[PDB]
Design a protein around this ligand. Structure first.
Ligand SMILES: [Mg+2]
Ligand SMILES: [Mg+2]
Ligand SMILES: [Mg+2]
Ligand SMILES: [Mg+2]
Ligand SMILES: [Mg+2]
Ligand SMILES: [Mg+2]
Ligand SMILES: [Mg+2]
Ligand SMILES: [Mg+2]
Ligand SMILES: [Mg+2]
Ligand SMILES: [Mg+2]
Ligand SMILES: [Mg+2]
Ligand SMILES: [Mg+2]
Ligand SMILES: [Mg+2]
Ligand SMILES: [Mg+2]
Ligand SMILES: [Mg+2]
Ligand SMILES: [Mg+2]
Ligand SMILES: [Mg+2]
Ligand SMILES: [Mg+2]
Ligand SMILES: [Mg+2]
Ligand SMILES: [Mg+2]
Ligand SMILES: [Mg+2]
Ligand SMILES: [Mg+2]
Ligand SMILES: [Mg+2]
Ligand SMILES: [Mg+2]
Ligand SMILES: [Mg+2]
Ligand SMILES: [Mg+2]
Ligand SMILES: [Mg+2]
Ligand SMILES: [Mg+2]
Ligand SMILES: [Mg+2]
Ligand SMILES: [Mg+2]
Ligand SMILES: [Mg+2]
Ligand SMILES: [Mg+2]
Ligand SMILES: [Mg+2]
Ligand SMILES: [Mg+2]
Ligand SMILES: [Mg+2]
Ligand SMILES: [Mg+2]
Ligand SMILES: [Mg+2]
Ligand SMILES: [Mg+2]
Ligand SMILES: [Mg+2]
Ligand SMILES: [Mg+2]
Ligand SMILES: [Mg+2]
Ligand SMILES: [Mg+2]
Ligand SMILES: [Mg+2]
Ligand SMILES: [Mg+2]
Ligand SMILES: [Mg+2]
Ligand SMILES: [Mg+2]
Ligand SMILES: [Mg+2]
Ligand SMILES: [Mg+2]
Ligand SMILES: [Mg+2]
Ligand SMILES: [Mg+2]
Ligand SMILES: [Mg+2]
Lengths: 117, 49, 143, 111, 101
RNA sequence: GGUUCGUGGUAGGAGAGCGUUCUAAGGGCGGUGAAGUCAGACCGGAAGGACUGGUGGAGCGCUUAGAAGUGAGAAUGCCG
RNA sequence: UACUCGGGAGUCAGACUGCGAGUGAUAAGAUCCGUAGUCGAAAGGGAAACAGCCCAGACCACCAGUUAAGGUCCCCAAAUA
RNA sequence: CCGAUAGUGAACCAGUACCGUGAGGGAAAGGUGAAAAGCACCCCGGAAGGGGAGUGAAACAGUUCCUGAAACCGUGUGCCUACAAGUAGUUAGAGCCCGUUAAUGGGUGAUAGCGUGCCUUUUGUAGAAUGAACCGGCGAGUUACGAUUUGUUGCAAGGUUAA
């Protein structure tokens, strides 16, 4: 028997066109450029899902360095003292303390100073 | 056998392989033939000996 | 999740006046660029502005080690054929110290719209008199 | 009840040549819009004038509205069925010619 | 007061009455979960663990066991006829913080 | 059900599946609205599958097998 | 892991880098062999950008940690050690 | 076995229209509704075409008239946009506007980081090498008879029929 290709192609192409909503110009209207746009966006998402962790760690390091230079300490010396004192708090929590609990951050910095000497 | 529960003997029937239907099956573009020879052409090939 | 991101106007921006007598050009400019960027605060958010305003006085006495006062050249091109012009660093220090400091500092700021906004926060004077006494700036000491 | 409309379906003028005149009488009082169409020297003005006057008339008769308090609420031009012709060019080839039509709609409502 | 607990290979800051999402834990809705790894207790007094503050725990109650929104992981290589598609849905556990000790 | 070692990949080998039209049997829904079509923030590891609402105005799924005119983004591809 | 038997293939335009030779002028991103690596068929970090150089092999998710080559004045994370 | 690009070239005044001196080549084009009940009458207009009224279950079924997708052309509006160098996205993100198949929701996005389309052919292509204006339909490992090898079933020193 004959199998004419109805109802199956449009359903498959419309999903790809719908996935490209918000793209400039005809990238959200035409199947052929929408397909390439969707593929490229998936690849970009896959790569940036790795780059995001590095970006946030760099932000935390910069913030901790800024907060620790006010205690007459580098980021390098402070991290060495914290490792040498036995404290195991990651950069995320240290940046949080630096931003909105500066007294506790100063306490931790004092402990790190004690450990160094 | 009720004609609505026909289960043929297991392993006696397999599924035919269809070539040239997309790259997800591994038999897509060139259809198991390689690139640009005499053996990649329709009806192409040499004699038996 | 939970990481602090600053908002426009949420961080106080202060005013500083820096005396540039005897300091090396690049060694002053690095510190000033860090101050303008906002990297000396635990509120530093990369995508907005949290830095301070800077006033530089006595720019006419900025230092230039070696033979840089005569052997360092600043080039411009007008985009007309054969329209390249030169100028030595000692001549600019004698005549336009403000523009020397501005070029030096501007080369050290990010090259985008935010960097162009940060450049507008720098005021350079060749003498020891500034006109921003209404903002009540403080004295900043280097290092 | 509050708006009346009239359309002119498949008029021979091309849409791009009528939109340029429609863009002049939008959101204006009918007494002024009629004068706008009367003193502009284009070919589409009489057609739009007839459509606007038809809309005003069937606003006054069908729904019993006040003529002096009417404005051009909305006016637009739509594409119609085009006619395909040909033009004999040089060296034995012909070129396509589109004799396009349009639909003109105007709606008048009180303000 | 607040504490810095460690759970799921990463550290979280918790206050009393807070709602947090963590990695999947062995527990049923309505149960009681205790965290015995506390790194720092703050608020009006500070005690720092080396690496853990001994004798201090945080008690929490399980609210929901579920899975997050769906992702679609997609990879391709241009001109090499290689594509690969896969969907992901990460399971979590939602907790409410009861008390800090 | 467990322990250990693994899981980049073109030509290419092997395996398991989705979806389309038709046939057979069982069992169904549909003028209290079928197929089609339009819109959604739902579900599955993928191909894909439901649910709700509008338009439509008479046919269509489900389960187990069987048979193929069996899935298109490219051919200075053919027609509109 | 190796071997034997059987079903199915594709390949027979290679490239550069280190070392050992020929031809060339002890020229060539030249050409032709031996040997190892990488690309081909390999993303990620460093050489500004950079198939073939240095580090190192991507099953998926994480706003966690320690390191490799290379780096720590500003652009740009980290010593104005 | 096909179901109007299919099945005869031709489901309809088809070997017709059209092309060629001639032999000869050779199309496109189905569907209102159960029943014409195919819109009396009024209004704008020269007419076409409309707005009411009426028939009809339906007129958004009004003579390409069942359904009516996409390209393409417009009208209205919520968020952004005139100091900016942009394979047009992705990750971080304020502000403003909403309210769902109710769940660590939806729309738009100032600003910041990273980022040279798809295919083919190549040692090697973002490639200044090839193809594609866009959208839709159609379009490529099949069948018969033999050979060989694997899997399954029946019988087994036997197995099996062809016309
Ligand atoms: Mg059929
Ligand atoms: Mg098709
Ligand atoms: Mg957008
Ligand atoms: Mg890291
Ligand atoms: Mg198969
Ligand atoms: Mg393959
Ligand atoms: Mg292909
Ligand atoms: Mg080929
Ligand atoms: Mg070849
Ligand atoms: Mg071959
Ligand atoms: Mg042939
Ligand atoms: Mg490549
Ligand atoms: Mg693999
Ligand atoms: Mg195979
Ligand atoms: Mg059907
Ligand atoms: Mg429906
Ligand atoms: Mg086919
Ligand atoms: Mg096409
Ligand atoms: Mg065409
Ligand atoms: Mg073998
Ligand atoms: Mg040979
Ligand atoms: Mg050879
Ligand atoms: Mg060789
Ligand atoms: Mg030699
Ligand atoms: Mg050489
Ligand atoms: Mg060579
Ligand atoms: Mg290898
Ligand atoms: Mg690589
Ligand atoms: Mg790389
Ligand atoms: Mg280089
Ligand atoms: Mg790079
Ligand atoms: Mg691996
Ligand atoms: Mg380290
Ligand atoms: Mg049809
Ligand atoms: Mg036909
Ligand atoms: Mg004739
Ligand atoms: Mg009929
Ligand atoms: Mg009439
Ligand atoms: Mg309708
Ligand atoms: Mg009917
Ligand atoms: Mg449409
Ligand atoms: Mg400017
Ligand atoms: Mg502006
Ligand atoms: Mg949103
Ligand atoms: Mg090759
Ligand atoms: Mg070549
Ligand atoms: Mg170009
Ligand atoms: Mg060619
Ligand atoms: Mg072209
Ligand atoms: Mg064959
Ligand atoms: Mg047997």
């Amino acid at each position: 028997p004959r199998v004419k290709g109805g109802t199956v192609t449009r359903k498959r192409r419309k999903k790809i066109v719908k996935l490209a909503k918000g793209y400039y110009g005809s990238k959200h209207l035409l199947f052929k450029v929408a397909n390439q746009a969707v593929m490229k966006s998936y690849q970009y998402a896959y790569r940036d899902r790795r780059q995001k962790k590095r970006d946030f760690r760099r932000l935390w390091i910069a913030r901790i360095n800024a907060a620790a230079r006010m205690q007459d300490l580098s980021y390098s010396k402070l991290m060495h003292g914290l490792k040498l004192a036995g404290i195991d708090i990651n950069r995320k929590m240290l940046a949080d303390l630096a931003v909105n609990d500066i007294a506790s951050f100063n306490t931790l910095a004092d402990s790190a100073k004690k450990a160094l000497a | 056998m009720k004609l609505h529960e026909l289960k043929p003997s297991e392993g006696s029937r397999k599924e035919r392989n269809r070539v040239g239907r997309g790259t997800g099956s591994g038999n897509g573009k060139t259809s198991g033939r390689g690139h640009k020879g005499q053996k990649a052409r329709s009806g192409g090939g040499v004699r038996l000996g | 999740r939970t990481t602090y991101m600053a908002k426009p106007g949420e961080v106080e921006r202060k005013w500083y006046v820096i005396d540039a007598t005897g300091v090396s050009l690049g060694r002053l400019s690095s510190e000033v660029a860090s101050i303008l960027r906002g990297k000396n605060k635990p509120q530093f958010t990369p995508h907005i502005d949290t830095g301070d305003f800077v006033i530089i006085i006595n720019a006419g006495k900025i230092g230039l080690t070696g033979k840089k006062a005569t052997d360092k050249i600043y080039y411009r091109h007008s985009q007309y054929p054969g329209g390249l012009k030169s100028r030595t660093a000692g001549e600019m220090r004698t005549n336009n110290p403000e523009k020397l400091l501005e070029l030096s500092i501007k080369g050290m700021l990010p090259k985008n719209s935010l960097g162009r906004q940060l450049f507008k926060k720098l005021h350079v004077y060749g003498g020891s008199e500034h006109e921003h006494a209404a903002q009540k700036p403080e004295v900043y000491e280097l290092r | 009840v509050t708006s009346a409309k009239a359309v002119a379906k498949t008029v021979r003028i091309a849409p791009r040549k009528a939109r340029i005149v429609i863009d002049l009488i939008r959101g204006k009082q009918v007494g002024e819009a009629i004068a706008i169409l009367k003193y502009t020297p284009r070919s589409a003005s009489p057609i739009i004038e007839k459509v606007l006057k038809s809309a005003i008339a069937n606003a006054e008769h069908n729904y019993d509205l006040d003529i002096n308090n009417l404005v051009v609420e909305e006016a637009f031009v739509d594409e119609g069925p085009t006619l395909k012709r040909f033009r004999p060019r040089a060296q034995g080839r012909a070129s396509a010619i589109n004799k396009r039509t349009s639909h003109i709609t105007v709606v008048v409502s009180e303000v | 007061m607040y504490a810095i607990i460690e759970t799921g290979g990463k550290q979280i800051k918790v206050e009393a009455g807070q709602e947090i999402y963590v990695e999947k834990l062995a527990g049923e809705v309505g149960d009681v979960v205790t965290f015995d790894k506390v790194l720092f207790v703050g608020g009006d007094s500070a005690k720092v663990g080396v690496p853990f503050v001994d004798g201090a725990t945080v008690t929490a109650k399980v609210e929901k066991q579920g899975r997050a929104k769906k992702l679609t992981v997609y990879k391709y290589k241009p001109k090499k006829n290689y594509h690969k598609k896969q969907g992901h849905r990460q399971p979590y556990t939602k907790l409410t913080i009861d008390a800090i000790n």
